[PDB]
Amino acid sequence: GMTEYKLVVVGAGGVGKSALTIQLIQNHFVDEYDPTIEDSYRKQVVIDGETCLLDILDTAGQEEYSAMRDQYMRTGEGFLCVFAINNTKSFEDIHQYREQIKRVKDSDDVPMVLVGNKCDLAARTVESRQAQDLARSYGIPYIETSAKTRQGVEDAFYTLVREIRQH
Amino acid sequence: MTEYKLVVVGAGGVGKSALTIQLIQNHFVDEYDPTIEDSYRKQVVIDGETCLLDILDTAGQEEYSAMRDQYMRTGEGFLCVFAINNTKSFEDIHQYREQIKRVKDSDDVPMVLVGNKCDLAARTVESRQAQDLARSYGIPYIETSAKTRQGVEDAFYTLVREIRQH
Amino acid sequence: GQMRLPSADVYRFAEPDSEENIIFEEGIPIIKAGTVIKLIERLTYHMYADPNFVRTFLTTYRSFCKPQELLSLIIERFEIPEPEPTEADRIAIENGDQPLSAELKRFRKEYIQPVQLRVLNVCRHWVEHHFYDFERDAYLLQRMEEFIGTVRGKAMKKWVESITKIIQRKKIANITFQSSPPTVEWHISRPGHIETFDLLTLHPIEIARQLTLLESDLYRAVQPSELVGSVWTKEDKEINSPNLLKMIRHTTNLTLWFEKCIVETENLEERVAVVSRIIEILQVFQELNNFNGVLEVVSAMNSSPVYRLDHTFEQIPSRQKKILEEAHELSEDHYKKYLAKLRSINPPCVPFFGIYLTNILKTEEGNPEVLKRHGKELINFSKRRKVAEITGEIQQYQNQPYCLRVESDIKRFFENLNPMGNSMEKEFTDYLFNKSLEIEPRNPKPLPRFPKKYSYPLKSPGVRPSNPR
Ligand SMILES: N[C@@H](Cc1c[nH]c2ccc(Cl)cc12)C(=O)NC1CCN(Cc2c[nH]c3ccc(Cl)cc23)CC1
Numbered sequence: 001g002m003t004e005y006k007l008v009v010v011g012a013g014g015v016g017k018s019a020l021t022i023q024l025i026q027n028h029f030v031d032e033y034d035p036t037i038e039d040s041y042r043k044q045v046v047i048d049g050e051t052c053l054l055d056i057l058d059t060a061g062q063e064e065y066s067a068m069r070d071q072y073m074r075t076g077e078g079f080l081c082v083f084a085i086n087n088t089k090s091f092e093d094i095h096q097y098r099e100q101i102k103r104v105k106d107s108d109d110v111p112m113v114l115v116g117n118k119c120d121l122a123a124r125t126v127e128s129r130q131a132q133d134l135a136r137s138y139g140i141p142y143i144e145t146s147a148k149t150r151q152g153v154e155d156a157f158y159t160l161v162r163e164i165r166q167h
Numbered sequence: 168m169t170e171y172k173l174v175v176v177g178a179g180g181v182g183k184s185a186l187t188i189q190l191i192q193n194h195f196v197d198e199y200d201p202t203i204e205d206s207y208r209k210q211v212v213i214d215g216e217t218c219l220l221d222i223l224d225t226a227g228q229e230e231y232s233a234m235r236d237q238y239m240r241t242g243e244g245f246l247c248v249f250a251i252n253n254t255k256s257f258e259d260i261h262q263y264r265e266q267i268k269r270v271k272d273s274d275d276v277p278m279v280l281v282g283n284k285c286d287l288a289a290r291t292v293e294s295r296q297a298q299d300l301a302r303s304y305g306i307p308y309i310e311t312s313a314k315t316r317q318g319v320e321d322a323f324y325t326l327v328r329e330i331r332q333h
Numbered sequence: 334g335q336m337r338l339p340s341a342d343v344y345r346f347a348e349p350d351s352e353e354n355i356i357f358e359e360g361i362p363i364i365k366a367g368t369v370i371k372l373i374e375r376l377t378y379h380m381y382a383d384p385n386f387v388r389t390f391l392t393t394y395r396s397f398c399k400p401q402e403l404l405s406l407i408i409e410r411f412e413i414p415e416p417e418p419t420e421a422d423r424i425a426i427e428n429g430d431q432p433l434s435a436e437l438k439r440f441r442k443e444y445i446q447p448v449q450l451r452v453l454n455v456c457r458h459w460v461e462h463h464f465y466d467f468e469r470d471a472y473l474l475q476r477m478e479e480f481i482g483t484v485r486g487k488a489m490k491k492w493v494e495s496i497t498k499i500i501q502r503k504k505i506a507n508i509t510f511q512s513s514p515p516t517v518e519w520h521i522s523r524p525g526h527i528e529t530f531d532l533l534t535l536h537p538i539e540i541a542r543q544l545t546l547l548e549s550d551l552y553r554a555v556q557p558s559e560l561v562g563s564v565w566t567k568e569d570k571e572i573n574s575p576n577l578l579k580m581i582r583h584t585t586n587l588t589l590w591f592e593k594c595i596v597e598t599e600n601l602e603e604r605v606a607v608v609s610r611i612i613e614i615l616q617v618f619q620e621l622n623n624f625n626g627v628l629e630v631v632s633a634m635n636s637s638p639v640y641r642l643d644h645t646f647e648q649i650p651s652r653q654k655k656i657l658e659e660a661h662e663l664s665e666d667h668y669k670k671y672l673a674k675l676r677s678i679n680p681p682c683v684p685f686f687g688i689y690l691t692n693i694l695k696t697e698e699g700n701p702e703v704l705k706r707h708g709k710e711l712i713n714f715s716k717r718r719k720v721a722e723i724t725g726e727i728q729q730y731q732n733q734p735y736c737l738r739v740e741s742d743i744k745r746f747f748e749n750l751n752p753m754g755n756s757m758e759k760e761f762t763d764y765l766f767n768k769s770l771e772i773e774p775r776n777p778k779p780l781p782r783f784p785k786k787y788s789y790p791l792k793s794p795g796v797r798p799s800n801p802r
């Protein structure tokens with residue numbers, strides 16, 4: 001039947017990365033979650049008139065298991081590389097995440113999107129223009145998201161699915 | 168995984184807590200810290216079937232004697248423990264047996280009679296007297312030592328089997 | 334009829350339940366949300382005990398109440414006023430007779446004594462299982478000692494004297510088995526010859542046993558204080574989660590050691606022997622229910638440097654391919670088969686901790702701290718119950734010890750393993766990948782030959798144990 005896309009979320013820990021998938025998969029309109037529930041990470045969606053199933057792997061909290069990253073990454077067809085807009089170190093980490101994905105997938109052209117996540121009201125330290133320039137140097141889209149209002153969340157995942165479809 | 172609610176009852180100081188901690192942790196507690204109410208969980212395979220034991224460890228001191236109905240309502244099966252060197256604790260067994268029957272409104276509650284501290288030479292309750300009581304209740308009698316582990320798995324897992332066949 | 338209660342003006346815990354102060358889930362009730370006063374009332378309720386709730390509350394309360402404030406509130410809960418004499422009592426006293434005091438005696442027996450005992454049970458559990466609050470705040474400990482040490486009256490005396498002793502023991506602070514542990518197994522390396530210890534010279538059975546003892550001890554050392562509040566992900570993680578991080582860093586180091594053993598063995602035949610030996614260690618991990626160890630091996634086999642070694646895996650015996658495949662399948666579909674296997678085995682086991690960490694973090698991040706109802710903010714207790722269900726599962730697998738004997742020299746060998754040396758992570762993992770490219774170049778580059786590096790026999794002794802008399 002419908003196509004299933006295996007998406008993988010990667011990025012620095014401790015800076016709200018998990019809010020992206022929680023807000024997507026959530027009962028959009030009731031602020032609640034049980035991650036232990038079978039298929040709290042699967043969602044049927046319609047993108048450009050075509051119904052598909054998203055299977056999202058977000059191992060948030062396991063960042064210290066650094067030698068497991070290759071195995072987790074190999075499961076994915078497309079990747080969201082996430083940094084926090086108030087944490088410059090998480091932005092500087094993006095280059096090495098992208099290089100690791102390219103190595104694991106053995107491809108110089110892996111579907112991926114750069115996501116700048118606003119996880120609190122602390123002062124932004126990565127400007128939009130810096131992140132746009134980085135994304136353009138890689139040839140990938142840039143999406144900014146809010147961890148509180150759900151803004152940008154659908155755009156991040158749907159943009160990635162379009163990158164897979166157009167690969 | 169089937170869940171079983173076991174409750175350990177009996178007079179103060181007979182070894183209910185020591186029996187439970189030996190089962191859960193393979194450790195013998197030397198101290199006598201009177202219990203108010205404690206609860207433990209254990210995943211274990213019994214007769215080829217995995218289950219989850221919820222074990223309620225209750226207060227034997229008489230000052231808590233008015234607070235028992237609430238835990239007897241929830242329990243599926245009861246370990247009724249006395250100490251084989253304490254005749255008063257053996258005489259207290261029938262009061263626990265009768266209260267459980269009243270609260271659960273049943274003549275047919277899964278139970279095991281446990282004579283603990285069987286590592287001690289100076290016995291005052293003979294096995295025959297306890298076995299006679301167990302037969303009158305229709306339940307098995309198992310002698311245990313929380314100190315050496317003798318009989319401990321047998322007591323708890325026999326109770327599980329009686330809940331499973333109930 | 335029900336017992337009358339003190340006036341809510343003199344005793345705050347007698348206010349009636351309403352949706353403005355407590356909400357229940359849809360046979361004791363399960364609380365969805367409430368004020369801190371209502372949570373403490375139900376924590377110490379006169380009608381029933383709730384040991385699970387005591388554990389849940391004491392594990393998670395610091396997200397909504399400070400330790401000093403909790404102690405003040407349970408002391409307030411303990412200090413219950415007694416009712417005044419009734420009309421019948423008054424008339425008896427006016428005649429020079431002793432009153433029956435029926436209502437007073439019932440209130441003592443059915444309200445004061447159960448509530449007070451349940452307050453003491455909170456104190457007992459707090460000191461026994463959550464003593465870190467008192468290690469980190471000496472004044473909190475002084476207040477607890479003073480409270481317990483000044484409870485009067487004989488109904489509580491046995492437990493007050495006991496709790497006083499338990500506190501004193503905790504301030505200055507042994508296993509028995511159904512059988513004997515199996516005999517320690519040796520291969521090329523002999524006892525005491527630590528300088529020859531290595532992947533292929535130690536017995537693969539004993540490698541798996543000693544790593545299982547080490548990894549079990551690391552698993553058992555992690556306390557809930559290292560997990561609640563997602564503190565292992567935050568800036569102070571080294572302060573707040575040291576045992577968890579030590580456990581993860583061991584797992585990472587062993588995975589990297591496996592990878593390094595493989596790719597630094599440049600001769601193809603020798604490298605096949607190395608990979609085959611690691612799969613035998615994985616087989617013994619499976620037999621021991623050491624799932625952390627199983628996934629350490631699987632992670633190494635699916636790493637970028639090892640996964641691409643097609644010439645090596647082509648020569649692995651088909652049965653070992655099947656062992657590795659069924660271990661890999663445990664992690665597929667979001668660990669579906671792993672979760673089912675963990676819930677089916679007979680402990681002792683060593684769980685993989687990573688799933689617990691992700692579920693605690695997402696439960697914290699995906700649920701609100703408060704629920705707003707009728708203009709009031711109620712503590713969202715359902716969210717805390719979900720976190721404590723996870724910490725309770727962790728603790729349940731921490732109880733059962735392994736019946737295996739420690740070998741102090743093999744233990745020390747694996748404790749001191751340091752495959753990265755002084756290199757940084759990126760440096761080292763690039764080195765491993767470049768070694769992989771050296772020993773099996775990308776097509777269409779030809780496969781080179783390399784000299785042997787091991788002077789001893791490569792034949793495995795196998796993983797079935799031996800038993801002399
Ligand atoms: N259909 C098979 C046939 C086959 C040839 N060689 C094999 C070795 C093992 C198995 Cl089971 C199958 C084969 C295939 O083409 N496999 C390719 C990708 C896997 N690698 C082995 C590998 C490396 N790291 C791992 C970690 C986990 C797991 Cl499951 C496997 C591995 C071989 C090449």
Ligand SMILES: Nc1nc2c(ncn2[C@@H]2O[C@H](COP(=O)(O)OP(=O)(O)NP(=O)(O)O)[C@@H](O)[C@H]2O)c(=O)[nH]1
Nearest residue numbers: 179180181182183184185197201202227284312313
């Ligand atoms: N020799 C021996 N001593 C035991 C055994 N079981 C318990 N004890 C000892 O008896 C004392 C009381 O044990 P305990 O488990 O606290 O009893 P309890 O029945 O739980 N008491 P309570 O009803 O007050 O909670 C402790 O000193 C304990 O070490 C046993 O099998 N053998």
Ligand SMILES: [Mg+2]
Nearest residue numbers: 183184201202
């Ligand atoms: Mg006890």
Ligand code: NA
Nearest residue numbers: 086087088125
């Ligand atoms: Na910054």
